[PDB]
Scaffold this active site. Structure first.
Site, short mmCIF file in Angstrom:
data_model
loop_
_atom_site.label_atom_id
_atom_site.label_comp_id
_atom_site.label_asym_id
_atom_site.label_seq_id
_atom_site.Cartn_x
_atom_site.Cartn_y
_atom_site.Cartn_z
CG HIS A 113 -38.05 5.31 -21.74
ND1 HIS A 113 -38.58 5.87 -20.60
CD2 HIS A 113 -37.05 6.14 -22.14
CE1 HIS A 113 -37.94 6.99 -20.32
NE2 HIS A 113 -37.01 7.18 -21.23
CG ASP A 162 -41.93 5.57 -23.78
OD1 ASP A 162 -42.03 4.60 -23.00
OD2 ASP A 162 -40.85 6.16 -24.00
CB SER A 201 -36.24 9.71 -18.83
OG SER A 201 -35.78 10.09 -20.12
#
EC number: 3.4.21.90
Lengths: 162, 52, 162
Positions: free
Chosen positions: A40, A62, A114
């Site tokens: 992502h 993902d 992230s």
């Protein structure tokens, strides 16, 4: 303490950063024999050879992974798959694994962070962070784990991608 | 001539679509053993489908 | 100290050398009731009646082994197959077993040093060295084991023949 120092030392070479339009937007990890980066976040890895190889990408989990070149294999992460009850270290303060869920205290992870790993007491990585959602004064994380062989994904409701 | 051309095109498109979809099915079934750190595919599934 | 003395005491009695063109090209070991050597090393065993006996060779597992002459059976090697993780002894220094892989520090094995056994904490043999692939400050070894009754083989990617 010294455990913070060793976590810093391992993250100093096990974690790389991705670049996009002059901003840092995610980190990639080197677990065992696989380079992992979540799907992502869009950008180019700030490295002279990691970005030059093919990447196996899946949008169901993902993430995207590749086989680590042998000329930098030594910087592994000593993977593990046991997930007992309790506490687990992190770059941004200790997190707690309870009731099959990962919880952190309210605001400790900003968007754009992230890709950090989650280490255990002995220094082994157990999960990689994808997102989080807040309830009350805590934040439940959304990560992917490595039980047995299957890479399962767990996400709580209302999560936001960082 | 038109009928033969149409039949040949239909047969080719059916074969191509089914082969591509079988390839996709294999790829999707074998995808999550290739993201796990370490570990290896079972030999049974490794001989049933070409596994790296 | 005493562990090193005991290791060399066993090695000077059990490990034999192989000669070719007047130069050492490898070592042949004796384990349990079998004399074993790697297949890639070509030469003449530095003994009279050891070479006079008939070997048995396989190239899948890349070695040759044969039966122990009766009067040298007393000099044994006390094999075992239990394989836990941690540290292990070796004539060129300690070797770390982790992640199903044996690894030595940086550069400690020159080419032509194949065949040296890897002993355990209690003084028993666990694997025979065949090759190695260097990386960073470490090197992943490629050896043969004795899991149950099958002699298996593990070679990391990019292994360099020794």
């Amino acid at each position: 303490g010294k455990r913070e120092r060793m976590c810093m030392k391992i993250e100093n070479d096990c974690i790389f950063e991705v670049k996009h339009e002059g901003k840092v937007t995610g980190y990639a990890c080197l677990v065992g024999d696989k380079v992992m980066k979540p799907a992502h976040v869009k950008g180019v890895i700030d490295n002279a050879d990691l970005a030059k190889l093919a990447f196996k990408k899946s949008s169901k989990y993902d993430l995207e992974c590749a086989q680590i070149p042998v000329h930098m294999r030594s910087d592994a992460s000593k993977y593990t798959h046991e997930k007992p009850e309790g506490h687990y270290n992190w770059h941004h303060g200790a997190v707690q694994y309870s009731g099959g869920r990962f919880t952190i205290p309210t605001g400790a992870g900003k968007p754009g962070d992230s890709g950090r790993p989650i280490f255990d007491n002995k220094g082994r990585v157990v999960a990689i962070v994808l997102g989080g959602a807040n309830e009350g004064s805590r934040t439940a994380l959304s990560v992917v784990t490595w039980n047995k062989d299957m890479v399962t994904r767990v996400t709580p409701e209302g999560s936001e991608e960082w | 001539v038109s009928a033969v051309v149409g039949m040949s095109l239909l047969a080719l498109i059916s074969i191509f679509a089914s082969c591509y979809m079988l390839v996709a099915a294999r790829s999707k079934c074998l995808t999550p053993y290739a993201l796990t750190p370490g570990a290896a595919v079972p030999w049974t599934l490794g001989i049933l489908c070409c596994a790296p």
